[PDB]
């Protein structure tokens, strides 16, 4: 400001009008340089490294996702192999899979009947993260990532659901006749295909 005023007091009047664009741009550039914030040798935290740490964390998380999915496929095949859909049973009558169920203690599937499909908890067992930072210390990106991961990857969808005859004196079916009789017919043929008249 001292230079411009001195030039103006000296009578040059050169910076009048558009010439003022030079002092104007200069003043702005000086302001940006002194407004950059803290950058040191110890205060190393900056976008170029935080992004890398963010990038490294996302990549590691996906390999854990792959491990879960690989385990989940194993459960789908196994449960279907033991409790198929009612419509597939008609062709299977000649197969050795019929009247396969046994009561001799080791067969845990005795007295269990397929009633439909739904949600179930996988065979995986998740360990809580050690040294968890407090809510104010949590980085926002990795927080929701780990948060959403636990909610969806903790259950497996579209699996065959079952009911056990060994657990209750009765099971009251409440709804319209068509639903009630429909399922019972499904229950009757499932029982009949998997268990013999001797049991």
């Amino acid at each position: 400001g001292g230079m411009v005023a001195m030039v103006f007091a000296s009578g040059s009047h050169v910076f009048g009008g558009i010439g003022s664009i030079f002092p104007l741009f200069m003043m702005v550039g000086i302001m940006m340089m002194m407004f950059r914030g803290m950058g040191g040798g110890q205060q190393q935290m900056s976008r170029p490294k935080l992004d890398a740490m963010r990038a490294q964390f996302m990549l590691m998380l996906d390999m854990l996702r792959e491990t879960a999915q690989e385990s989940a496929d194993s459960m789908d095949a196994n449960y279907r192999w033991f409790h198929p859909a009612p419509n597939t049973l008609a062709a299977a009558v000649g197969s050795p899979r019929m009247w396969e169920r046994k009561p001799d203690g080791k067969d845990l599937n005795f007295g269990v009947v397929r009633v439909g499909v739904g949600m179930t908890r996988p065979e995986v067992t998740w360990g809580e993260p050690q040294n968890m930072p407090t809510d104010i210390e949590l980085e926002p990106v990795t927080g929701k990532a780990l948060q959403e991961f636990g909610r969806y990857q903790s259950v497996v969808y579209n699996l065959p659901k079952m009911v056990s005859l060994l657990v209750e004196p009765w099971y009251a079916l409440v709804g319209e006749r068509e639903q009630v009789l429909g399922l019972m017919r499904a229950i009757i043929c499932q029982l009949a295909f998997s268990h013999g008249p001797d049991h």
Binding site: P86, N87, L89, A90, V93, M98, G182, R185, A186, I188, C189, A192, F193, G196, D198
Partner: peptide, 18 residues
């Protein structure tokens, strides 16, 4: 399952014995 499907399944099963 309908009654027809059940009877169809039932007829197929009635063919077998121990």
């Amino acid at each position: 399952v309908s009654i027809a499907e059940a009877e169809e399944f039932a007829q197929k099963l009635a063919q077998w014995r121990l």
